[PDB]
Nucleic acid binder design. Sequence first.
RNA 1: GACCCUUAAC
RNA 2: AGGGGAUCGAAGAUGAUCAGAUACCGUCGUAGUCUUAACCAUAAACUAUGCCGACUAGGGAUCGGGUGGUGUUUUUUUAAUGACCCACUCGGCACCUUACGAGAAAUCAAAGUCUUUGGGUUCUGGGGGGAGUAUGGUCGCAAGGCUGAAACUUAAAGGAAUU
Lengths: 216, 87, 81, 96, 25, 206, 97, 129, 121
Amino acid sequence: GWVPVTKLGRLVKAGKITTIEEIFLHSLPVKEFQIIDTLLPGLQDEVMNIKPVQKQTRAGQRTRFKAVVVVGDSNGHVGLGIKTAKEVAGAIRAGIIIAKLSVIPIRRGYWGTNLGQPHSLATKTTGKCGSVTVRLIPAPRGSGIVASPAVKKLLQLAGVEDVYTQSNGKTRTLENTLKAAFVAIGNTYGFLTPNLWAEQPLPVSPLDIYSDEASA
Amino acid sequence: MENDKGQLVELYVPRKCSATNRIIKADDHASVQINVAKVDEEGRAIPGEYVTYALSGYVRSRGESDDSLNRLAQNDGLLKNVWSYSR
Amino acid sequence: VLVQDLLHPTAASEARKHKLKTLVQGPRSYFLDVKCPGCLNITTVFSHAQTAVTCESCSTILCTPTGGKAKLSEGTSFRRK
Amino acid sequence: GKGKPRGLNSARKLRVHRRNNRWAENNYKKRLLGTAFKSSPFGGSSHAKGIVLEKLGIESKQPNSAIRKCVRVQLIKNGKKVTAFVPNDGCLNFVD
Amino acid sequence: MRAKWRKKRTRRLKRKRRKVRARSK
Amino acid sequence: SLPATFDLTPEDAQLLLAANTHLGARNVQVHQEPYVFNARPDGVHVINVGKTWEKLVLAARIIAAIPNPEDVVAISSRTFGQRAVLKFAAHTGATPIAGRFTPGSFTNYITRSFKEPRLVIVTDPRSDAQAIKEASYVNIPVIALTDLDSPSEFVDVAIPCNNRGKHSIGLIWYLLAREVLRLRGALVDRTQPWSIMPDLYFYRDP
Amino acid sequence: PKKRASNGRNKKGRGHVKPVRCVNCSKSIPKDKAIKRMAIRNIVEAAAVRDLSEASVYPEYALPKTYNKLHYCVSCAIHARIVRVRSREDRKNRAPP
Amino acid sequence: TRSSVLADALNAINNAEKTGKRQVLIRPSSKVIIKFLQVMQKHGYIGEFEYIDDHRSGKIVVQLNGRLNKCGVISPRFNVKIGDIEKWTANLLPARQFGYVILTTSAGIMDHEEARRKHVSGKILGFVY
Amino acid sequence: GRVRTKTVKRASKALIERYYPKLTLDFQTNKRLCDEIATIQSKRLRNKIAGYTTHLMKRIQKGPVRGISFKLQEEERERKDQYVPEVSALDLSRLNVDNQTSDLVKSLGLKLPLSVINVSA
RNA sequence: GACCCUUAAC
RNA sequence: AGGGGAUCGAAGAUGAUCAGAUACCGUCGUAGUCUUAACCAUAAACUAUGCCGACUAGGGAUCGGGUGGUGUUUUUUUAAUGACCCACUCGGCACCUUACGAGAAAUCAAAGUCUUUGGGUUCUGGGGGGAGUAUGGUCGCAAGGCUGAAACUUAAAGGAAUU
């Protein structure tokens, strides 16, 4: 079946934790991809590009393919996985595993007057990887995802429907742009807003109380 | 955020570091949750009773984590003459 | 050291730091009452005098200029303030 | 302070600095020098008519090997002698 | 070629141009 | 407010002074350590033993709050702490390590030395940098025995004591086990001493 | 790129340091950049010492030594193996071997 | 030399906020600084601040809670019409539902929403969020 | 050359770690039990293991060898680390303190018999 | 000690 | 341009290379580092980092100068001091990390506080080449300095890593 090897992987297997927000709440480290695909059973993966990389050797170039995979359900969770393998099919599968392992929550907000469900981002957010930084600006209804197709797909896989995007650097370096967007998309929960100035109490962690579900 | 028409939203209201009150990120794996047990008039740790402190990975990497805990728990009264405000 | 009482520093910490780096800058120098032996002729002398002070009675030089605090002459006694 | 002046009364310096530095742009320099008007063989027009003077066998630049079919053309409005490609296959026999 | 000597070669060329222009000016 | 029975007793004082816990680090001391009390001439710093003891009880309370006894791990790379951790780990659950730490013990789930602890105790932050560094990947708190010049980074609780004395390092390990057991109830009598003595925890070369 | 933070020499706060001539090739090298080695050698080469001492007219003769500060250019220091090419990390070790 | 004491004060607050410190010393405590802090304090971005009366120019120690993300100065103090407030708020504030553009008007130092309901304008001092 | 590989080094180490009281220093009497204790597919290989077993046996005979730990060794190792002294550190082990240490005890409000010995040159 | 060069020809 | 010219030594003849060697190596050797109305004004003139100001981590050392320790040692031996030792402090030359932060990276005590973009201010750049090449101007005795194009031609040139 699965037979997880981790306390957190055991807890999700045992069913004592049912939300990925509870994993995100206590910043738990996740090391198995099987716990992502059970706690988020609606993740859709995609491939933004496949490119070969070559290491020059004494006799010829060793060609390996770098697969970029973006994983996410269409509401609030998104992941990004890069893996270079000797075969494209092997790289896709492993890059899926890394993409699910790296899934993060998304903070969707409103452009104004909190009328319906969150359609946009709560704040302006920026992330940088290499020379690339991606700026994400909240947009009103109907604006859509104003972004390049590669950034756009990851962003619609996150659950946002109205956004503005602004970039600089080598946007043609695809892996950097997606990682820069991933950081900006991830930094949406790092930003502290007045409605998040609330009380401390921080209840017990799932791993401490449910430690009865250890390897024994 | 949460509007009036129900609409259960703002998933995962995150924790905040006790020392600095900054948001603990979902993958900030340098942050810790300190559990300091309580004792009831006999020097025996009563189960399930402890004061909890969230400690951001930022202060942990800065070496201020030890100083922060001495100040926080002294303010809570479980250390007496360790931390000085006037340093 | 994230949390610090910057309004009430310790006297040891305040005394340690530079005179312009304390919460309110203050002179570390002082005035002292110097008398020669015999005749009282009490003369008030700045600690960092930088001029050779002699008492008002006669030529009885009481201190020698120094790069910092003025060194007092061999035969004399001084009281702070 | 980022180099450039920031004062509320430094608009002239920012204006003059921009003016001087637009000359490093190729298009602004070419436009305001009027190079197309003064140097280009069409005089700044999209098209020009002329008379064919001779058939040409311009060789291809490396790494391609081919004989491009071109014609020397003296433009009517200028008298300047230019070289025009005859594009399609066998169209040299139309532009003899 | 070495920029030092290309600078020197141009300077010798400039010197010759000054001399050849002087015999007409 | 402690119940006024955890205060440093005179017997625990003499235990510290004979072990030379108070004798602080050399002419170098870290600015994140307010544990210094009244340096003597020749540059030797004197450590406030009360703060050492007070932090010692605080560290024990954090240890006792962990529900599974084995889920705490004691770590010691130095020779002087190698015996102490095992003796400390003998009297509690505390699945220990001694000697070399294996990189990938906290990450690298398929390593044969994998540990999923809720609390890590290290004898020397400088000599156990890898253990502390790897502890900053998996969200686990760290308790450390830190001298006045120790690298306090990633250390949540620091017990001030000299790291250049095998008597004091072993004594602090001894007191940590005794305090933790006293809270857990294994040592019922708070006032009465422990039959086990600190010289069990000390090191010996041959 | 920049190879060394000290630029291959010892000159921060000066601008100019007077040259010294290499003892192998007489190359002009700034003194702060030379590879100076101090040679303190027994004057009898330690294999004739007993022959010299047994032929000496004085008992327990002090056997004086010769003192010479030898300056090398970088080329001659490397060629005569006074210094050797080092890895990028351990170029930062000022402590003598 | 020293040009904007508000800039150095806001820089000290920003650098203290970034390092997690709960307090910061400010020199030399102009009245514009105090008004900028009171607007900050009114919205809860700092906490308590104490003026120190050295007979020269004043010192401020500001207590810092963890709420302030960035406070800044806009230099020069640009003239802001009523219609230009939207451009300034949209250019530097992280969102529309929180954050304040602080401007000095003839009715006093205030944040932009207070200048909107009082229907005043003037020169922009800075921002807080 | 003369060096042997892991397949005989770990095999010999594994046997000693498990079968210590059954084998001994002599090669000939160790060959007879190595081929019946462990399934070895080659005459040459079994000869190599028996040689490396008796080699470590000679080394074990004089002091412990790093890496190998059998049941007898670890049992006696425990007996070594359970030892505790009889006398206490408090008494004459053949309270020295300084001025700053002495007033530290008085600041803490404790009374202990200690001789205040300042820095005497 | 001395040691220059290297296909237009898929 | 007068004085000095020991030394070394652009220029200027032997030997090896031979196809040379009017190069590198030997021996010489003129001009060439002192005073001027003196000129020239350029260097990888480099920290390839403009200046002023504020703030942001650690740790020792050193140069100055002060402060505190009846600290240690010193004429006529323990009757002015000096030189050392600890602790501070101000200013300076610097010094240990792919370090929070910054960076394309190398790396960075600033090259941080920069898409969460504004402390003040000067100068410079806008693909490579043609080309720092004048039809010009100006300074200079000259050598040259400063200022400084266009035609034309290119798909790269370039930086830092990796193998």
